[PDB]
Design an enzyme around this catalytic site. Sequence first.
Site, PDB file in Angstrom:
ATOM      1  N   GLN A 199       0.790  -1.259  -0.127  1.00  0.00           N
ATOM      2  CA  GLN A 199      -0.067  -0.059  -0.119  1.00  0.00           C
ATOM      3  C   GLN A 199       0.634   1.179   0.121  1.00  0.00           C
ATOM      4  OE1 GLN A 199      -2.760  -0.615   3.261  1.00  0.00           O
ATOM      5  NE2 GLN A 199      -4.162  -1.728   1.843  1.00  0.00           N
ATOM      6  N   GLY A 206       4.467  -7.117  10.584  1.00  0.00           N
ATOM      7  CA  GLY A 206       3.693  -7.974   9.776  1.00  0.00           C
ATOM      8  C   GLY A 206       4.248  -9.514   9.762  1.00  0.00           C
ATOM      9  N   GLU A 217       4.218  -8.179  17.321  1.00  0.00           N
ATOM     10  CA  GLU A 217       4.893  -7.145  16.390  1.00  0.00           C
ATOM     11  C   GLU A 217       6.397  -6.653  17.092  1.00  0.00           C
ATOM     12  OE1 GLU A 217       1.125  -4.727  14.359  1.00  0.00           O
ATOM     13  OE2 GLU A 217       3.035  -3.933  14.493  1.00  0.00           O
ATOM     14  N   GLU A 266      25.843   5.989  -3.356  1.00  0.00           N
ATOM     15  CA  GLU A 266      25.904   7.461  -2.729  1.00  0.00           C
ATOM     16  C   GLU A 266      25.320   7.508  -1.432  1.00  0.00           C
ATOM     17  OE1 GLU A 266      25.853  10.624  -5.659  1.00  0.00           O
ATOM     18  OE2 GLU A 266      26.696  11.961  -4.083  1.00  0.00           O
TER      19      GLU A 266
HETATM   20  N1  LIG Z   1       2.297   2.937   7.441  1.00  0.00           N
HETATM   21  C1  LIG Z   1       1.691   2.155   7.295  1.00  0.00           C
HETATM   22  N2  LIG Z   1       1.491   0.944   8.096  1.00  0.00           N
HETATM   23  C2  LIG Z   1       1.092  -0.087   7.711  1.00  0.00           C
HETATM   24  C3  LIG Z   1       0.005  -0.377   6.577  1.00  0.00           C
HETATM   25  N3  LIG Z   1      -0.416  -1.440   6.950  1.00  0.00           N
HETATM   26  C4  LIG Z   1       0.082  -1.896   7.785  1.00  0.00           C
HETATM   27  N4  LIG Z   1       0.820  -1.412   8.484  1.00  0.00           N
HETATM   28  C5  LIG Z   1       1.724  -1.770   9.644  1.00  0.00           C
HETATM   29  O1  LIG Z   1       2.117  -3.043   9.654  1.00  0.00           O
HETATM   30  C6  LIG Z   1       2.336  -3.586  10.611  1.00  0.00           C
HETATM   31  C7  LIG Z   1       1.461  -4.949  10.303  1.00  0.00           C
HETATM   32  O2  LIG Z   1       1.944  -5.497   9.228  1.00  0.00           O
HETATM   33  P1  LIG Z   1       1.292  -5.980   7.717  1.00  0.00           P
HETATM   34  O3  LIG Z   1       2.080  -5.380   6.723  1.00  0.00           O
HETATM   35  O4  LIG Z   1      -0.098  -5.461   7.816  1.00  0.00           O
HETATM   36  O5  LIG Z   1       1.304  -7.490   7.813  1.00  0.00           O
HETATM   37  P2  LIG Z   1       1.920  -8.333   6.741  1.00  0.00           P
HETATM   38  O6  LIG Z   1       3.192  -7.627   6.008  1.00  0.00           O
HETATM   39  O7  LIG Z   1       0.803  -8.133   5.535  1.00  0.00           O
HETATM   40  O8  LIG Z   1       2.187  -9.969   6.848  1.00  0.00           O
HETATM   41  P3  LIG Z   1       0.840 -10.803   7.184  1.00  0.00           P
HETATM   42  O9  LIG Z   1       0.854 -10.720   8.698  1.00  0.00           O
HETATM   43  O10 LIG Z   1       0.932 -12.204   6.831  1.00  0.00           O
HETATM   44  O11 LIG Z   1      -0.597 -10.274   6.904  1.00  0.00           O
HETATM   45  C8  LIG Z   1       1.300  -2.847  11.809  1.00  0.00           C
HETATM   46  O12 LIG Z   1       2.337  -2.325  12.586  1.00  0.00           O
HETATM   47  C9  LIG Z   1       0.582  -1.637  10.966  1.00  0.00           C
HETATM   48  O13 LIG Z   1       0.691  -0.595  11.780  1.00  0.00           O
HETATM   49  C10 LIG Z   1      -0.001   0.911   5.908  1.00  0.00           C
HETATM   50  O14 LIG Z   1      -0.722   0.689   4.822  1.00  0.00           O
HETATM   51  N5  LIG Z   1       0.761   2.172   5.951  1.00  0.00           N
END
Ligand SMILES: Nc1nc2c(ncn2[C@@H]2O[C@H](COP(=O)(O)OP(=O)(O)OP(=O)(O)O)[C@@H](O)[C@H]2O)c(=O)[nH]1
EC number: 3.6.5.-
Lengths: 429, 317, 438, 54
Positions: free
Chosen positions: C15, C143, C183, C254
């Site tokens: 995203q 994640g 996390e 760099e």
């Molecule tokens: N800044 C930002 N942080 C995000 C976003 N989506 C998830 N996060 C952060 O990412 C963390 C969770 O990880 P995710 O990226 O949603 O999980 P994943 O990488 O899809 O891995 P899975 O557990 O298999 O779903 C949390 O701390 C969320 O706050 C986003 O779109 N923008």
Amino acid sequence: MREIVHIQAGQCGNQIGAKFWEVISDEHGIDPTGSYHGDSDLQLERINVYYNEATGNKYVPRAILVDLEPGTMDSVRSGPFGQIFRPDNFVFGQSGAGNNWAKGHYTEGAELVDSVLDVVRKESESCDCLQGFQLTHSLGGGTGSGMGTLLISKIREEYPDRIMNTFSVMPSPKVSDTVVEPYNATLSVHQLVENTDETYCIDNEALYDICFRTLKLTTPTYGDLNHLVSATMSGVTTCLRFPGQLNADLRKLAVNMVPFPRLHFFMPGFAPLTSRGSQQYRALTVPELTQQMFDSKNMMAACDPRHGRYLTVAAIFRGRMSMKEVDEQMLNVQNKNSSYFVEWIPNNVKTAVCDIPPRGLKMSATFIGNSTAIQELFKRISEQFTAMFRRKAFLHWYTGEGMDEMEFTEAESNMNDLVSEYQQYQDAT
Amino acid sequence: MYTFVVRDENSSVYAEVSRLLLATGQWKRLRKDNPRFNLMLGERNRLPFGRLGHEPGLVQLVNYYRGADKLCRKASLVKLIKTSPELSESCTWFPESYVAQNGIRHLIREVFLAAYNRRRNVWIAIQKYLEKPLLLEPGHRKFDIRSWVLVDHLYNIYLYREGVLRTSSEPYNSANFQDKTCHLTNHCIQKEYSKNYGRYEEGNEMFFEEFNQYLMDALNTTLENSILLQIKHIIRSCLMCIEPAISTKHLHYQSFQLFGFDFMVDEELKVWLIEVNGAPACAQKLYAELCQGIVDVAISSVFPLADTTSIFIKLHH
Amino acid sequence: MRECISIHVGQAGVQIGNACWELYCLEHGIQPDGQMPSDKTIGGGDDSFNTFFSETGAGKHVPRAVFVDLEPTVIDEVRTGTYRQLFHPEQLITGKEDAANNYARGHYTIGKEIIDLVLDRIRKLADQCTGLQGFLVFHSFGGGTGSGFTSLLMERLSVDYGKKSKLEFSIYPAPQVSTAVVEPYNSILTTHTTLEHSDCAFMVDNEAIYDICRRNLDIERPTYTNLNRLISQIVSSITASLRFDGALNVDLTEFQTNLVPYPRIHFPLATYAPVISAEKAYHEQLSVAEITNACFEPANQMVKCDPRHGKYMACCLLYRGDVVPKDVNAAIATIKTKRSIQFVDWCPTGFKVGINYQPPTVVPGGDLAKVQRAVCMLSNTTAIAEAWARLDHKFDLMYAKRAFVHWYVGEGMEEGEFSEAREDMAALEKDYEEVGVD
Amino acid sequence: MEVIELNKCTSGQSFEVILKPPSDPSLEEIQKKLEAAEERRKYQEAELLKHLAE
Ligand SMILES: Nc1nc2c(ncn2[C@@H]2O[C@H](COP(=O)(O)OP(=O)(O)OP(=O)(O)O)[C@@H](O)[C@H]2O)c(=O)[nH]1
Ligand SMILES: Nc1nc2c(ncn2[C@@H]2O[C@H](COP(=O)(O)OP(=O)(O)O)[C@@H](O)[C@H]2O)c(=O)[nH]1
Ligand SMILES: COc1cc(C(=O)c2c(C)oc3c(O)c(OC)ccc23)cc(OC)c1OC
Ligand SMILES: [Ca+2]
Ligand SMILES: [Mg+2]
Ligand SMILES: [Mg+2]
């Protein structure tokens, strides 16, 4: 749409199960015929979780109805939504279990178990990505207790990497069918500790007291009890059945709620407590929803949270509400009562919000607590167990089915072992 | 309800602040490692400032200023005064210093010798550079002045209107430097080595009423004009100097701190800065009043209580 | 012209990748169908924007990007959203079941099954490059996929692409808008495994972005969309030197040279210019001095920490808009008199300045207002170690009871990998103290 | 305080201003670690099935 397979077993299992399918079918806009007559796409976007999309543009619950006698299941077919179910998914014996865990687990239930697995396996074949299984049953009877746990054991054998989830109704002498209920419950808890990922402890003692002390129902039926259970089961499944920001599923629920594999018994709680007849018209404010949902008078397991501390908490709000208010009120409760949350699990309260409220209410909240105070329920059961086991009372019912006293002593000590684990973390700092 | 934790079990002044906050009925004390607090009465060493101000829904305040150690440690205070242009090589109120009792040479460094080698006297390593200490001739004795200063989250500089004079008990002799008592007015060395601790005033602590009265009877001046004005300057100067380094004005957590300034008044009524102590004890009589001032000014200002003059002198800017 | 491949892993990486490539298309004048009318050399080229876009014979400019998630929902929104035609379908890689917020399951059980296919689709892009520089890898710390699979991908990229640079854009977990209880575990595990394979990592603490949206955009509860559009503004500033004509940070190497004097201390702190609301009915445009001074306010950093209590090893000022060197130097001279900016002594106290005359670009119907001048400061300060201390403490609180550890050991990990990871983090914190504290 | 390395172009400028002067495992090893974990996983799965067998 990671699919769930639903199983209901025994009188309690099917009566509570039938009400669950009534509630969610109304939420998703499914009439008893099986077709969808609702107003929003949100009702269908995740319909596959609990329904197969049958031919002819109809939705069929992915539910298997199981019993060792035909009575309760014939009444489900006669019920308001009995048509909704698939007829091949009705699997019944004719001899009953006589409120005997041994009959359900080792003898009568053993004739019928493979017949049920054939239906479970048929439903899992057509699943694109099965999450796992949710079973509804009581622990005090014979079928849902003895055979429900035997089913659980057999499903774990065939589906070892899927989630096993149960709604388990705990017996109480206040709503007692039979004296041997502490025997049946203690044997089944031993099973649930080993072969379950998440169990909702639905205590009939708590259900009774809420109807008596709160809803001012003087003589409560199993109907009034099952109205509370159906509303809770709809609440805890909200994040599975509706689109959310979490993309929640059964595994992520277990991963985040269960810090120790055996400590997976949850205390559920519901929004404002409501009776079937009373339609009261004042909507709750978000502070009220939060205060009430953490109140002991709203818990479905007869335990006082102030006698333990929360390992993990999951809260689900339903309705149109300011999520700033929700965030402010939930941080208020944790900050105002930090002594009842373990400090060694940071951010152990997760809240989700869903914009569609349940039927008949404009505001609602569901509570899922993993509290060390649940040990009160287990040692209440084991006290009732030991009181008659030290005299070996009523054991002949079970030894006449091949069981030994030794198996009772082992289930007793494992549940006492369960109590000691909840105790060690309630004092851990 | 407000929330606080205690992490310095040996602090006399914050043990009292703890008692008061609980006795308001609006503050509750959690166990030390609970992160969901409003107020941290932190350690004196390795306080984890990096963990403050990250709790959603909580305003967090702490009774220490991160970086204030550069004013409260002997070595860094010398490098701070010499390096800060606000204070300079030429600072008229700090004793000449380059980097335990006193004497002449032999230690116990290049630039030290040259200044000591520009002499055609006494040194320490309560300082004794000033062999002209200023006598309290109702006994001919030495003293030191301790003023307690509170700096709140807004960086107002509050000087408690009550200060203490820790005094030597026996006459000052210009050739008794191995005899540390008669001219080292530390209280703990004064209860052990001294000869008549407690004759002229109780506990070797003369407060400002008796001392100002002495200045009027004996020298026709006042404490306000002859000493406190200089004290107010030195406090205002040091704290304003390091304000860019330690201020929490635009931070995710807030800081206040109570300091103790040690002063030395020479015979010509000139005030010298000895030491700044970041974790100072307080005189026993004044505990109740000062700790109540800490709550009103430093804690209740951020965390107000329900609706139902001043013991400090605000040093401005 | 030396090409760069972006890799976006997990939901947060995907995203944020969308928001970045949307911004990139607007900055370069590329339409959602992939055409670029300003580009008068058709079918190819070695322009500076070709660092991030290859060209097809049909005149179509496609991102040199790979989106991978172990679960299809998020990337499915890419295949259907505004920029369907922008990406080759083979660049959008999805599994069937995610890592369930579990590093072990993302790195071992589920990730092992998809690592080979991702590497091949990644290699299909590399074979289109005349002189590949390296990779930009976007992921979350928290994640299961963004932590577990990223570390698995980072190892295999080091063996297959030994001589290529790898920079990270990492989302540091904040309870304000997090997802999972575990996390802190996933963050420590992935940081330990990736440390020796990453050349430069820009950490973004979701707590900083969240409060910047709360304070400066007057958004009561910021969404991921709100956060990601701001992050892309910062990311675009950092990568603009790669996609536009310039002398400073022209190539990925760099970034290491200018920002990273020690390989393990490779987490530069990003502080960003003005964040102004589009809804603000009347705004005063901030001068060069005001936005440069704003770079030293913790309220504007991507990670909340106090640079006054650390030491700088490098500082870069990346300007965008109406900015001339005369104004920059005047603002730096003014700031040095009033702020606590101290370098390690084996480093010159100095700023490296880059200026792009094109003012920052804003998505139509976004939250950021159009601004006449902006700056992104990249400073490598030991103060960012505060974030490691914060994270390592939460790790310690849970691991002391071995809470949730059975979920990881159940997927094949050993308990020793947890303590092995934490010890590397303890050594990382000790390194930061050596460089930064007296 | 001096300006250094000034480069100008139509897109912008860049310079350096100096205020004061100064005073991997193999593919064989990755495969081993990944399979040592699959064996540790298949063992615990076999413990469950042999336990369910009894
Ligand atoms: N800044 C930002 N942080 C995000 C976003 N989506 C998830 N996060 C952060 O990412 C963390 C969770 O990880 P995710 O990226 O949603 O999980 P994943 O990488 O899809 O891995 P899975 O557990 O298999 O779903 C949390 O701390 C969320 O706050 C986003 O779109 N923008
Ligand atoms: N809440 C609730 N509890 C029930 C219901 N029916 C039975 N029970 C409880 O379940 C236990 C009896 O188990 P039962 O389901 O009848 O046994 P089974 O048919 O052999 O599986 C007793 O403790 C009852 O109080 C019901 O409809 N609702
Ligand atoms: C299946 O039903 C649920 C699942 C999840 C869930 O998958 C979690 C995810 C994705 O992160 C979490 C989390 O961090 C938690 O912390 C206590 C608890 C649960 C989670 C969250 C729920 O309510 C909040 C559910 O109840 C309706
Ligand atoms: Ca071209
Ligand atoms: Mg019955
Ligand atoms: Mg995901």
